[PDB]
Design a protein around this ligand. Structure first.
Ligand SMILES: Nc1ccn([C@H]2CC[C@@H](COP(=O)(O)OP(=O)(O)OP(=O)(O)O)O2)c(=O)n1
Ligand SMILES: [Mg+2]
Length: 324
DNA sequence: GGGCGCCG
DNA sequence: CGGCGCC
């Protein structure tokens, strides 16, 4: 099935390499986009030119296409499976924390294995230190069952501190993903707003106790409106440490709150995208009119997600659908 | 597409 | 402070 696949597949690879292997954001942007548009198309893309017809995709993209069309490969593409350097780079990116810049440097010092990484860890930054530490786990996804469990675990101590703490795990969860990547938890409490501005400690508390109780083990960031971290389940003799994150909002904006944290990357963007077009710019905070002159306006009334899409003249989508 | 928190 | 890597 799904016809224009191979090609798309092929397409993206390119992008990341250009993304990663080079900065070439621009090429990567295009590439990605190009991958997209090709997939949304409904016919067997025979002639790579046919494709060319198709908007966005251009001449060189166009080229890579037929190469593939003739024979299942692009040497450029093969180079990756060939050139050490780059193959190396990709790995590192597999590491949480280590993004390309740092990744390069790491190779630039011949650091080019997981093992290597260990060997002179000394060069890493903590965040990275932790990644390496945990590496293995991070590959394995979190199964819904646990996710549920975890969820609870949270809910408890949360409310225990103060009843008035809204907790809501979102992201993949809201999208009914049989397996999710990490705990994406939203948070709120009745006094906090655009007009209270402070109290971040509330955030600080949950974790505080979360840490105390023996949940979050590790701490990647303890910012005032956000927290990234690691945790893991309790045992009887073991399970993987899971990434975790919590974010707290000014209750008054709760709605963008669910929106963003849920969304699905692309999803949010589309919207956010559509929005600008429609005279607004959304945020995980608010939606405001783009007062033509440029100016983001005074926050829009948001009693539910609905309002948003509505505002945007877009049909509401219910979470599990959200994927695009 | 938008913004948060690390750090050098 | 960019500039990173993540969300
Ligand atoms: N640049 C970004 C990154 C994330 N998001 C939002 C959407 C959901 C959340 C990111 O959650 P992830 O955990 O990355 O996504 P997920 O779908 O929850 O994936 P996972 O299976 O890893 O939890 O933040 C966003 O709008 N823009
Ligand atoms: Mg990485």
């Amino acid at each position: 099935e799904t016809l224009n696949g191979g090609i798309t597949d092929m397409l993206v690879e390119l992008a990341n390499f250009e993304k990663n292997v080079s900065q070439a954001i621009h090429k990567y942007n295009a590439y990605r986009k190009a991958a997209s548009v090709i997939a949304k198309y409904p016919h067997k893309i025979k002639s790579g030119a046919e494709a060319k017809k198709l908007p966005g995709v251009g001449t060189k993209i166009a080229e890579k296409i037929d190469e593939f069309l003739a024979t299942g490969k692009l040497r450029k593409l093969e180079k990756i499976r060939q050139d050490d350097t780059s193959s190396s780079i990709n790995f590192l990116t597999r590491v949480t924390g280590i993004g390309p810049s740092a990744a390069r440097k790491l190779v630039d010092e011949g650091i080019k294995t997981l093992e290597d990484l260990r060997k002179n860890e000394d060069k890493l930054n903590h965040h990275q230190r932790i990644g390496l530490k945990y590496f293995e786990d991070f590959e394995k996804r979190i199964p819904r069952e646990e996710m549920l469990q975890m969820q609870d675990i949270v809910l408890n101590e949360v409310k225990k501190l103060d009843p008035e703490y809204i907790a809501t795990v979102c992201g993949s969860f809201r999208r009914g993903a049989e397996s999710s990547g990490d705990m994406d938890v939203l948070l709120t409490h009745p006094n906090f707003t655009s007009e209270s501005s402070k109290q971040p400690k509330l955030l600080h508390r949950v974790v505080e106790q979360l840490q105390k109780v023996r949940f979050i083990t590790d701490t990647l960031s303890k910012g005032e409106t956000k927290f990234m971290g690691v945790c893991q389940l309790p045992s009887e003799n073991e399970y993987p440490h899971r990434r975790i994150d919590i974010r707290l909002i000014p209750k008054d904006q709760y709605y963008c709150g669910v929106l963003y944290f849920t969304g699905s990357d692309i999803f949010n963007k589309n919207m956010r995208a559509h929005a600008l077009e429609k005279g607004f710019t959304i945020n995980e905070y608010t939606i405001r009119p783009l007062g033509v002159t440029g100016v983001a306006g005074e926050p829009l009334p948001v009693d539910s997600e609905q309002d948003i899409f509505d505002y945007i003249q877009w049909r509401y989508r219910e979470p599990k659908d959200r994927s695009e």
